[PDB]
Amino acid sequence: AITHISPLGSMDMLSQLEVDMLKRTASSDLYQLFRNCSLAVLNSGSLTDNSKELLSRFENFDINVLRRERGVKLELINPPEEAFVDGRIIRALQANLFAVLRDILFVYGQIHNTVRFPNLNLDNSVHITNLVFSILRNARALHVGEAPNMVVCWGGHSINENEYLYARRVGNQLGLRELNICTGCGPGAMEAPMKGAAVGHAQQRYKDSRFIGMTEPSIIAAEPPNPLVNELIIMPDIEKRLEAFVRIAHGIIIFPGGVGTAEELLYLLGILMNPANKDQVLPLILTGPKESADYFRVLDEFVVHTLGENARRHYRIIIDDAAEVARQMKKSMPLVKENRRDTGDAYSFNWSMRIAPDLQMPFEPSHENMANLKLYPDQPVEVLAADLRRAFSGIVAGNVKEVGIRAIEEFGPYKINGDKEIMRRMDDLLQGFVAQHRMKLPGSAYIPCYEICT
């Protein structure tokens, strides 16, 4: 079974040298990744328990890039049947298919292994930001003149029915207020709010739904985007994905997501508490069903007792009140618009927010690096927030990730230079997630895997 797909929504106006480039990249060591992402996209919304095994059902699927005088076509070999309706590919899959071609072959292929974009220095913090903007602009995701209304939703890939219901309700309440949704693109909390918002949009006869799925190559290669997504963007790596979330967001909503939730909040506080960002407007709301109350309590307790009472100027917790979450998002859009007008910033992309270069770069949780963290109350709060994220991420990896356990077994616990008040707060928070089964440790009791010294 072989079918030729023409472009839709992207990759529809290429030069002959660009197509030449695309064909070369498709024949590179990148093919496997390109093929797995394109397979992921074609399996979107195919109901399945385990998605890793679903893709392992189409091992005879392949994809070639076809050259034509006018540009590019896609050749699908043994594609999933469910992606076709009386022989024609379903339009939504077709557009996501060409977003994968765009972001994996055209962008990622000129970045991975060697940077071929002329004069791009990926070690340069301004270049990075301009790249993230170029990717989003290339994806046609930044509209000229559009008044702000994009709400980014973060939260667990794997969540229970209560949480999925509540998140769906928030999205429905955002939908009834004509707000748009951007998420990480996968299942769980990344899907429920879009599903809700789609119902809301229909009720308000709102015809410009933007459901933005912002992912990255390692993830989309194994996880089909959820079926609500109608604007797929694959950023080159997780640091750039996070910067993209921040810069397109007009508001951020965090649902529960395990330990990662606290890492996300610390990243945001590290940005939002930088004195350079004291005049930015970016509403941040943490919200769950009534059963997540103690989950957000320990989190909020850890933030205040390490970063201070001022931390609460920047985030607000709301338990089981979907309508009030959306109501507050909706009310803040006009303030975000004024804030953008105030600095002459763009409505669709927040240029003026300062994201420190360390927040753009990866962090290796080695014993050396773990050691260099200055976890002391006398540090600038935005630096301490940042270092706290690094340390929390390292302690948890040392418990749950095999590359982290490997480091601990080989070299013993991490040596942490920190105030023991701060480090106690951390053990409370870690203990909290273990007790609440939000953190599931291999084996039994919670392992410190760290020690407070030099």
Ligand X SMILES: O=P(O)(O)OC[C@H]1O[C@H](O)[C@H](O)[C@@H]1O
Ligand Y SMILES: Nc1nc2[nH]cnc2c(=O)[nH]1
Ligand Z SMILES: Nc1nc2c(ncn2[C@@H]2O[C@H](COP(=O)(O)OP(=O)(O)OP(=O)(O)O)[C@@H](OP(=O)(O)OP(=O)(O)O)[C@H]2O)c(=O)[nH]1
Binding-site ranges for ligand Z (CB under 6 A): 4, 6, 68, 70, 73, 145, 340-341, 344-347
In the bound complex, what is the minimum distance in angstroms from residue 88's beta carbon to ligand Z? Answer: 9
Among 135, 242, 391, 422, binds ligand Y (CB under 6 A): 242
- Of 98, 84, 82, 76, the C-alpha closest to 12 is 98
Backbone dihedral angles phi then psi of residue 366, each to the nearest 5 degrees: -70, 160
Does 24 bind its own copies (CB under 8 A)? Our answer is no
Q: CB–CB of 428/298 below 8 Å?
A: yes
Q: Report d(CA 451, CA 423) in Å as an integer.
A: 9
Contact stretch for its own copies (CB under 8 A) within 62-70, 243-251, 356-364, 406-414: 62-70
Please count the other Cβ atoms lying within 10 Å of the Cβ belonging to residue 434. 17
| Contact of residue 203 among its own copies, ligand Y, ligand Z, none (CB under 5-8 Å per partner type) | its own copies
- Write down the least CB distance from residue 163 to ligand Y, Å: 13
CB of 62 to ligand X, least distance (A): 27
Residues 351-390 that bind ligand Y (CB under 6 A): none
| Contact window for its own copies (CB under 8 A) among 54-62, 204-212, 275-283, 287-295 | 204-212
CB-nearer residue toward ligand X: 260 or 308:
260
For β-strands 180-183 and 71-77, DSSP reports them as unpaired
Neighbours of 210 (CB within 10 A): 18
Q: Is 231 in the site for ligand Y (CB under 6 A)?
A: no
Residue 264 as a binder of ligand Y (CB under 6 A): the answer is: yes
Which is nearer to ligand Y, 76 or 303 (by Cβ)?
303
Q: Does the footprint of ligand X cover residue 413 (CB under 6 A)? A: no
Type of residue at 149: N
R_g over Cα of the chain: 22
156 binds ligand X (CB under 6 A): yes
The answer to whether 185 touches 215, Cβ cutoff 8 Å, is: yes
Binding flag, residue 352, its own copies (CB under 8 A): yes
β-bridge mates for residue 181, sequence order: 151, 211
Specify the residue, 45 or 308, whose C-beta has the smaller distance to its own copies.
45
Which of 1, 222, 238, 435 binds ligand Y (CB under 6 A)? It is 238
Task: Select from 27, 4, 13 the least CA-distant residue to 94.
Answer: 4
In single-letter form, the type of residue at position 324 comes to E
State residue 226 phi and psi, 5-degree precision: -65, 160
Nearest CB to ligand Y, comparing residues 242 and 391: 242
**How far lies 245's CA from each of 79, 97, 261, 371, in Å?**
32, 22, 15, 30
Q: Which pair of structure tokens corresponds to residue 120?
A: 């791009």
Can you list the positions of beta strands (E) in 245-340?
A: 251-254, 284-288, 316-319
Please enumerate in sequence order all residues whose Cβ is within 8 A of that of 415, keeping only pairs 6 or more positions apart, or say none: 367, 370, 371, 450, 451, 453, 454
Picked from ligand X, ligand Z, its own copies, none, the partner binding residue 204 (CB below 5 to 8 A depending on kind) is its own copies
Q: Which of 50, 56, 60, 114 binds its own copies (CB under 8 A)?
A: 114
Distance (Å, rounded) from C-alpha 403 to C-alpha 10? 38
Query: What is residue 213's three-state secondary structure?
Result: strand
The site map against its own copies for 211-250 (x = CB under 8 A) is ----------------xx-x--------------------
Q: Which is nearer to ligand Y, 185 or 307 (CB)?
A: 185
Q: Is 251 strand, coil or helix?
A: strand
- Positions that interact with its own copies (CB under 8 A): 12-13, 15-17, 45, 68-71, 85-86, 90-93, 95, 113-116, 118-119, 122, 126-127, 129-130, 133-134, 137, 142, 144, 176-177, 198, 202-205, 207, 227-228, 230, 327, 330, 340-341, 343-347, 349, 351-352
- Positions that interact with ligand X (CB under 6 A): 154-158, 184, 186, 190, 219, 257-261, 264, 438
- Positions that interact with ligand Y (CB under 6 A): 154-155, 184, 190, 238, 241-242, 257, 264
